[PDB]
Ligand binder design. Structure first.
Ligand SMILES: Nc1ncnc2c1ncn2[C@@H]1O[C@H](CSCC[C@H](N)C(=O)O)[C@@H](O)[C@H]1O
Ligand SMILES: [Zn+2]
Ligand SMILES: [Zn+2]
Length: 834
DNA sequence: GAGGCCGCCTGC
DNA sequence: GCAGGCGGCCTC
């Protein structure tokens, strides 16, 4: 009711006199106290905030600054959240004291000084541990920022964080050269923490500028002819026009300019920073020259051509800084330079767009002259053959002692690639129990890891139940494989590592209305871990495959919570849907490159083009490459050292019938079972594959052009399935027309890869009749080999697999692609520094 | 055995 | 509307 200032006003401003205390209804209030408020726009019952400032206005009104908390129910957590728990957020605002509903108790819960070694009345008392970022779903440690002489009156973490953020992202001119008739020339500018100078290079969107070389529009493909429905009875199911793994809609990688001039104008006597122009020399990517794509197949993805072509461009369009060097200017070798840091390109020649020839670069294209990092001791659970820890190893952040893998062939393979790790094949529940019970070793004399040994913990838990392909996920098997993530969390609790990584399939975020996700995040929060989740697309990290994977990252209290890696390669946009919705809110990762990227998309050609031809059933585990690496990608995976022998280029031996089918799948992109002819085929011995027979009306699909029926079963007519309607050994598989109408016509089954395209998600057993079925070679009539699958996953050719062909396929299919793991690992490395 | 057969699927 | 996709289960 009545509000009155208690005490002497501190630091009186011009329009404000700030106070540290006030009285409302006999109750005493002070800065740092917390308070309740009732919202007007609320579907949410209550608001809670800290009082940062108490000033009175010259308008006579009496004000305070509110730094809002967030209730765990308003975070990704939701109803799983602890009801007493609040999080700090970047919401704050000025408000009239009249609005305070009450004074509430809010306590800060710090991670214990012993935190690492743990994990074995009052109408209500609120608490907070972590600061929440609503946009990225990041739970991070509170800022350490402290108030001082001038701050103590208005000090607000939200305000500060906002001021720093918009200060850092706003464009500013650093150095000025000369003013002429209103135009200012600048030597130095900055935005978003990056400093740009004359002579630096810059990433622009593909649309920023064009090249003197122009691309040709010409004639689109006219219908080659009407199809013959008698011969090709299932072709009509192709009306969609969508080609799985097509690269046609893939964006171009960034344009790259070299900065020659920088200018802007003036506004109100001062330089207008909001508008800054850059004048650039354009670089050509090889595919931008007349050579186009088919002339660039063999070039380094980071090689450019210098040109004197210029363009003017807006600063605001700059996507970031990159390094471009003249090869001969290099103190080190080109490989060493390319491998030494991100955003690194080079050029040897220059491109004349007029003459279409390559020249030594002009003198002005030349540059002037014209800490041992300790590896985290890592424990890899559900290690598989080791893809994930292989990626971490390439990133130099981890040395993996202790892998746990239950499936023997995978553990063997891990061992073969990891001479220095103790690999336990036990059930992880059992092992955890053993170490919990005080055991130093296991029956085999393998030393168990103990609290303090494990710095980093990582793994993919079984994805079989979480997979959207799994019809039976509701049964006992899939559920059993589901409790394992809780087991993994138990490891995290017990060992309390500095860094935590959990990987799974994308569907892991949507499963059981996102309950799994919510519960594991809640778990990590209870433990006191900084954490976050996100979905990454492997393709954006340099393999030619669509693999969308859920990644959950946690960091111990003392650490810095890593960020998800920014995409390196462009990739087809439909295959890029990375957002997740939980409880009606949309969440995205910290990732800012939504359209383009620094490197061109890695292709199927780039992946397997060097592999010797083989037939269905090839069993030769060691055969010579006959040839050199044909691509950048192949060069990266084959190494530079003499290595004449190609391993695992074997492929499954498919039945005579399946092999005839494969033989009749056309080579063209988007080819699959729907292109099969309906014809009789002589199989092995006296076995004959008879035509498929259509004896039922399909009430949905109607009659063919010829007038034939389209049904293979009575269910086509809305009647119940009749067994004995089932036809055997037909070229066109009976079951596909059977259920096609509710399966999207089983697109991709017996499908081919295309050279210019990418692989569909590489699974544990390539099967042309499997739900993910375009496993055919772009050319040869056979399923992809183990080597080819390994390549699709970005494994080095030297990585060893163990067991029979199905075993190796499964080890490959299960793995986190090393390039993805490498990217994530580099983010972690970023945290290890500072 | 590994291949024929497949969800009142999910998700934007 | 239609495209995704470390699949499981039952047996030629
Ligand atoms: N109960 C259990 N205890 C320990 N390991 C198990 C297990 N159940 C399944 N596994 C194993 O966990 C493995 C996960 S495969 C994951 C591979 C890894 N992420 C990589 O990059 O290579 C499977 O191969 C499976 O055999
Ligand atoms: Zn504020
Ligand atoms: Zn039927």
């Amino acid at each position: 009711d009545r509000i009155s200032w208690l005490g002497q006003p501190m630091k009186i401003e011009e329009n404000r006199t700030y106070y540290q205390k006030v009285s409302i209804d006999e109750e005493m209030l002070e800065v740092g106290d917390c308070v309740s408020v009732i919202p007007d726009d609320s579907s949410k019952p209550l608001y809670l905030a800290r009082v940062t400032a108490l000033w009175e206005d010259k308008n006579g009104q009496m004000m305070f600054h509110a730094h809002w908390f967030c209730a765990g129910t308003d975070t990704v957590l939701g109803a799983t959240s602890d009801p007493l728990e609040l999080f700090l957020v970047g919401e704050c605002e000025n408000m009239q004291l009249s609005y305070i509903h009450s004074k509430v108790k809010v306590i800060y819960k710090a991670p214990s000084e012993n935190w690492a070694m743990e994990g074995g009345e009052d109408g209500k008392t609120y608490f907070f541990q972590l600061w929440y970022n609503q946009e990225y779903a990041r739970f991070e440690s509170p800022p350490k920022t402290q108030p001082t002489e001038d701050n103590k009156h208005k000090f607000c973490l939200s305000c500060i964080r906002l001021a720093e953020l918009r200060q850092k992202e706003m464009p500013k001119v650093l150095e000025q050269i000369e003013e002429v008739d209103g135009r200012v020339y600048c030597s130095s500018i900055t935005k978003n923490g990056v400093v740009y100078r004359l002579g630096d290079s810059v990433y622009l969107p593909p649309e920023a500028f064009t090249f003197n070389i122009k691309v040709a529009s010409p004639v689109k493909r006219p219908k080659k002819d009407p199809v013959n429905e008698t011969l090709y009875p299932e072709h009509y199911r192709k009306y969609s026009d969508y080609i799985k793994g097509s690269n046609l809609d893939a964006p171009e990688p960034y344009r790259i300019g070299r900065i020659k001039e920088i200018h802007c104008g003036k506004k109100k006597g001062k330089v207008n920073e909001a508008d800054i122009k850059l004048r650039l020399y354009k670089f050509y990517r090889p595919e931008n020259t007349h050579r186009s794509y088919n002339g660039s197949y063999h070039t380094d993805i980071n090689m450019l051509y210098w040109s004197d072509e210029e363009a003017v461009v807006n600063f605001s369009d700059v996507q970031g800084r990159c390094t471009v060097e003249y090869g001969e200017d290099l103190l080190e070798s080109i490989q060493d330079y390319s491998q030494g840091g991100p955003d690194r390109f080079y050029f040897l020649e220059a491109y004349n767009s007029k003459t279409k020839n390559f020249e030594d670069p002009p003198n002005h294209a030349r540059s002037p002259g014209n800490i041992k990092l300790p590896k985290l001791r890592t424990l890899d659970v559900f290690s598989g053959c080791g893809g994930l820890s292989e990626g971490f190893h390439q990133a130099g952040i981890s040395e993996t002692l202790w892998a746990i893998e239950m499936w023997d062939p995978a553990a063997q393979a891990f061992r073969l690639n990891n001479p220095g790790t103790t690999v336990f094949t036990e059930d992880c529940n059992v092992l955890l129990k053993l170490v919990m019970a005080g055991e130093v070793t296991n029956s085999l004399g393998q030393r168990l890891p103990q609290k303090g040994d494990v710095e980093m913990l990582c793994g993919g838990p079984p994805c079989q139940g979480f997979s959207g392909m799994n019809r039976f996920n509701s049964r006992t098997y899939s559920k059993f494989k589901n409790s394992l993530v809780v087991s993994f969390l138990s490891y995290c609790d017990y060992y309390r590592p500095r860094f935590f990584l959990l990987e799974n399939v994308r569907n892991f975020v949507s499963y059981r209305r996102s309950m799994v996700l919510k519960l594991t995040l809640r778990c990590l929060v209870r433990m006191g871990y900084q954490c976050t989740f996100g979905v990454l697309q492997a393709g954006q990290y340099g393999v030619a495959q669509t693999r969308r994977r859920a990644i959950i990252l946690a960091a111990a209290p003392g650490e810095k919570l890593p960020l998800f890696p920014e995409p390196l390669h462009v990739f087809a946009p439909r295959a890029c849907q990375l957002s997740v919705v939980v409880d009606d809110k949309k969440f995205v990762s910290n990732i800012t490159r939504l359209s383009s990227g620094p490197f061109r998309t890695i292709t199927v050609r780039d992946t397997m083009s060097d592999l010797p031809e083989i037939q269905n059933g090839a069993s030769n585990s060691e055969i010579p490459y006959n040839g050199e690496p044909l691509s950048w990608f192949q060069r990266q995976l084959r190494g530079s050292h003499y290595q004449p022998i190609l391993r695992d280029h074997i492929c499954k031996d498919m039945s005579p019938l399946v092999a005839a089918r494969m033989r009749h799948i056309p080579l063209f992109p988007g080819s699959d079972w729907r292109d099969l002819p309906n014809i009789q085929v002589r199989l092995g011995d006296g076995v004959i594959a008879h035509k498929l027979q259509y004896t039922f009306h399909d009430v949905k699909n109607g009659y063919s052009s010829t007038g034939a029926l389209r049904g293979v079963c009575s269910c086509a007519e809305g009647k119940a399935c009749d067994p004995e309607s089932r036809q055997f050994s037909t070229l066109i598989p009976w079951c596909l027309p059977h259920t096609g109408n509710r399966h999207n016509h089983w697109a991709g089954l017996y499908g081919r890869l295309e050279w210019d395209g990418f692989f569909s998600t590489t699974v544990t057993n390539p099967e042309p009749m499997g739900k993910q079925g375009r496993v055919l070679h772009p050319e040869q009539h056979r399923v992809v080999s183990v080597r080819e699958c390994a390549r699709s996953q970005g494994f080095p050719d030297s990585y060893r697999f163990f067991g029979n062909i199905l075993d190796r396929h499964r080890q490959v299919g299960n793995a986190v692609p090393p390039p993805l793991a490498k990217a994530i690992g580099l983010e972690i490395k970023l945290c290890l520094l500072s």
